[PDB]
RNA sequence: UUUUGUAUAAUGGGUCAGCGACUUAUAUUCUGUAGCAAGGUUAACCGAAUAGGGGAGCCGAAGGGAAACCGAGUCUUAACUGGGCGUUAAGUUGCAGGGUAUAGACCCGAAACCCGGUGAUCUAGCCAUGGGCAGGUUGAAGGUUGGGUAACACUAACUGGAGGACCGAACCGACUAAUGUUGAAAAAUUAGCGGAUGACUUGUGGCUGGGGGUGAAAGGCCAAUCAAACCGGGAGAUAGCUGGUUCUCCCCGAAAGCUAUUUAGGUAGCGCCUCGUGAAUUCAUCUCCGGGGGUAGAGCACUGUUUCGGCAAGGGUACCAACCCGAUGCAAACUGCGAAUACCGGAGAAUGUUAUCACGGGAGACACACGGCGGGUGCUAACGUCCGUCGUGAAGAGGGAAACAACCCAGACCGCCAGCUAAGGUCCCAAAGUCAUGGUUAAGUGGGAAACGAUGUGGGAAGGCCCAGACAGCCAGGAUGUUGGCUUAGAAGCAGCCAUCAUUUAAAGAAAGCGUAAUAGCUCACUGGUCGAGUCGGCCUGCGCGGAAGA
RNA sequence: UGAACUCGCUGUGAAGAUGCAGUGUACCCGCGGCAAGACGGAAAGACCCCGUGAACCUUUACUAUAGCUUGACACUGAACA
RNA sequence: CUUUAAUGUUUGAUGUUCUAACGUUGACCCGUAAUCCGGGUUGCGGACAGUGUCUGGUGGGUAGUUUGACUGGGGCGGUCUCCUCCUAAAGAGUAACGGAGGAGCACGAAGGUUGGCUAAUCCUGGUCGGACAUCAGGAGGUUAGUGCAAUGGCAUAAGCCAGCUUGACUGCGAGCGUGACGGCGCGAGCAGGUGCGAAAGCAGGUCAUAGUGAUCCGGUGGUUCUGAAUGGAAGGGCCAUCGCUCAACGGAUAAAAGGUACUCCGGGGAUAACAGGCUGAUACCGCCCAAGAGUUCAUAUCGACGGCGGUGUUUGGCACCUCGAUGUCGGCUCAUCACAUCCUGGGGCUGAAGUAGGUCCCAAGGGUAUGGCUGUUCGCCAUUUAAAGUGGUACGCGAGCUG
RNA sequence: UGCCUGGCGGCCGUAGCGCGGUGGUCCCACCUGACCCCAUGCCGAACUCAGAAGUGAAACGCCGUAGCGCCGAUGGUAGUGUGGGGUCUCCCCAUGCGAGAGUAGGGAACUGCCAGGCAA
């Protein structure tokens, strides 16, 4: 006995796996170890658009229900990996700097501890010019400069 | 969990003794062989009857098993 | 008005007077009307102009295909004995009317969104400037005096003066109770409670202006309104939702059904409703003829199910049991059999305002309930829910049933002080037999209710004994061992193992009841005499009683 | 406040009867009190449900973006290793 | 030209130095009695920063939306298409969250034709072999088989085997069945060319029902059909075919999950919760045959195995009135009535000696408490009596009051 | 004209089975060899070729036998359409139709065409 309800779940996923593979670009493509139907059907769903485009992905799908896709699923799960990788990056990055904005020694002592040779004068004095062109309503040059000195420490850490 | 409903296929007889018929009418929907064809009667693949050329339906028992056979004449 | 359904105790109304609800324009389809007629017709514009010009323009008479293209033929294919669409009916301009779609297009009733402005004299916060917070209470630091230590600390006094300190006015907060909820006020008043030198309060002036301000940070307040203020516009937003739609008469007059629907109270198609045109003894009733069923019934050839008896594979031979054999059953999911209705076609006398079918315009409706008929479901309970058909009401008043649309008879054109009749009644209220014939009932049954019980009543089949006199009664009898062997404790007939014998005999059994430790004693089985006729145990029962007690 | 010549009981009734059928009682009209009912009056129920109705809030629901942010292009040049 | 080497040209990535662009909310002077602004000198960094367009990523902070339907209140549980049997009342068709089950395949053959052939269950004989393998004989007549769950049919076999082929072909299809419709199915027969068979004749798929998806759009082959001046091409039109668990399967978007007790709006007793009505499984009570208990002895008292009766005092179903408002459990004042009687009163039986008791009939004229436990109705405990009774009245009374 | 035979149809269990008898004058069947035609998942088994030497055992055709199987009335019964009644989850009244099974009985066949042998 198999459940229409689990049938139609599998469906949805497949769906969902054929729609993230053909919105992936063109180096992901290469890299994911397509056939040559299954590629020449995506690269015909990526040229075509509307309704003709949703039934194109429901043909990948139907062919993905009896072609494996433990391959497809491990490539998607590697790309994800290092792409949440690098926003989790930029997200701690700019965290950061908004608590180096907001708070001020606290911060500071963070990005010490993050990364040792970081120049507590150099992000003390980044961190006032921030907070003046805050209060004088002018650009961002000081937040700007402090996130690039982060990202010149974390590049240098890792 | 159970009675789930289907579309009836509307089997049965749909023309009758002393009623005259055309060529290529319907006689009898069956889904089974329940009445033979005879002379001016022909079978189809989806074992319906069907007349050959104009005439009245007639229905008669013949064979050694006494099946139902159904014929046509020109009156 | 709502609905299957209303006085219902579901909806609205106090009334009078006035105002108020399907209009209008653009294009399309059809009907009636007027003309012309294979032609009709003008728009804008000119026009001393509702005339006359203006044929610009539009519609059909020739259509098919997507088109090329072909042509009364075309499209499909190399093309058909082929098939779809054209020919044999005449189109057009105005008027009025029935719809269609656009415009708010029958009307009233919403929340809610955007745009442009107004407010911080109410209210929240901040800023600046002034005032007020009675009175009485113990007092920390510091200083001074005597004792004390080498010196401090410590001790007993004077000065000293801070409490989100204590009691307690004015004042402030509404924390609690009540007053009131159109109020005294669209949140105020009374009586307590809390603070009463502190983040205190207040007069005055300014700022914070609405996807925003403010909030000692409960969605609180922002001019009596705040989970998004007020004023004008979009905007008479939209609304599958509530409600209303106003004068009269006549004819016809259904449904709450099927398919479909982000669909269940909305809406599209068909049946059902109505008007017109064209069509065949077209259709209905009844008689006859030819029909296939698989329902009732019956049965178990077959499929399940069920009891008994036997051979009994297999299984662990007093022991379980398969495949089978004979009988009894059951089945909406079984039919070796099988109908009456139901339906199709043909023939026919007669009736039915063609009651039958095709097309066009407009509908309404798509919530149905009950009884009968065979049911699913539910408990073979439900004024419970769902199926196929007739009727009722919805859409039908009247008469009967006390009142009740689904129970019974019966379809209101109007009037008449007429008769008959259907159901239902005839003692009366309340109209009519206190009618007649042969019976049942002694209970208020009639005038709610069952398993069961019973010398109630009338009869039937009957059954046993009966003037060689029956049943029950009237003065009579039941005498002797049988205090028994037996479990001897006494059962002796009145508790049991036991025979169930025997004399007097018109007649008596080695025994049925009452009670004594057992005794004993009194009746009954049968028997003398009179009267004497009928006497006794059950079944069927229609009609009767109990079981039957609720405010 | 539809209009009232506005009694109780049994049963029915859109199912709790001042108004129906049967029955019993009761002179008509006023005033001081009780309050069983006229499902009293109040708010087009806050409770349950309907609406391809609205508004607020949450996000690993959908669609975009303020903001943040990578790089390229002009402001933006001169000397050389 | 593939492969290299000095000078001379285009420069790019990269480093240093400089300043003339650029900022200076750094300093000094003037317009100026001037913390604005502008102008002149210098220094500070300096082609960095930022600015304008695009682009990669993040981004409920903001703006616009969604979260379907059936459902014995709602959620959960189960289903949304097609096929077989009964319900489905002997034409067709006919519902339920009714009962039993399957399908979204597969076959270049398992299709067409020609020829030939006919199994289950058991008995007998026989090495493994034994009831059930295969061999010979015996009855059999469809119980076998007919690919897929089911139904009917199949002796001419629609079942099995062998020789050849793809008619599983192209262009049509009168005439019918089925649905409101889109649509789906049957179908003799006409033209061309084929397979089997000498032939009459059969073959337009599978013994027959599920194995499938409209429309829009795109992909491939053909077509001068058209291609907006001409000659082409691109783009379009048509014929053949492919692309959807669009499974929410007659399928509204290519694109959407939840709360609001801070909610509102227009309604529904079409639809709920407290109360009314119907109904009476359940609950209470009474009784019948009666095994048996009761020191023997059924009915002094209980009394199984079974059934029959009254009420609505708990648990049950409809929502038939009610959502344009019926204020839903307790306490107090007011109480009313029935007896299925706690006592008082009159009686029967008794395993009733007397007081004191056990059971039943009539009788409602009358009486029928206080405190702790919970909000409690109710019930337990302690104390007195004659008791400290059971029930209906919206589980009486919020048009009486405190919750 | 008929005792017979083989085939072609109607009707198809009154038509088919159990028992005995009956036939080789023609036809039918059995049978011999298969070298050749023909084919066996091996076989003259099945089918086919030339014969009929030999026979009527099996089958085949006919008769008797009722033992089965089968058909089968009449009446009754179940049931049921119509209009009603009742102690109305069931039954009854008037009317129309009418089962299944069983009984009496029938029953072990009839019929048209062609071709051949016998006597007529």
Not at chain 1, 89 to 105: A, P, W
Not at chain 2, 33 to 46: E, M, Q
């Amino acid at each position: 006995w198999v459940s229409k309800s689990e049938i139609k779940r599998d469906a949805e996923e497949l769906k969902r796996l054929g729609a993230e593979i053909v919105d992936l670009g063109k180096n992901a493509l290469d890299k994911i170890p397509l056939d040559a139907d299954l590629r020449a059907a995506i690269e015909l769903a990526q040229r075509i658009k509307m309704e003709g485009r949703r039934r194109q992905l429901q043909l990948i799908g139907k062919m993905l229900r009896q072609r494996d896709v433990e391959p497809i699923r491990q490539a998607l799960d590697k790309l994800k990996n290092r792409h949440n990788q690098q926003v989790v990056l930029f997200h701690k990055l700019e965290n950061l700097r908004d608590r180096l904005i907001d708070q001020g020694d606290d911060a500071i002592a963070e990005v010490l501890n993050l990364w040792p040779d970081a120049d507590r004068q150099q992000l003390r004095t980044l961190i006032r010019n921030a907070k003046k062109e805050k209060e004088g309503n002018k650009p961002p040059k000081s937040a700007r400069q402090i996130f690039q000195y982060l990202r010149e420490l974390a590049e240098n850490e890792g | 969990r159970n009675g789930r409903d289907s579309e009836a296929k509307r089997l049965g007889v749909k023309r009758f003794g002393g009623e005259s018929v055309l060529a290529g009418s319907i006689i009898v929907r069956q889904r089974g062989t329940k009445f033979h064809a005879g002379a001016n009667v022909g079978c189809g693949r989806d074992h319906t009857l069907f007349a050959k050329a104009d005439g009245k339906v007639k229905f008669e028992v013949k064979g050694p098993k006494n099946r139902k056979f159904i014929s046509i004449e020109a009156e």
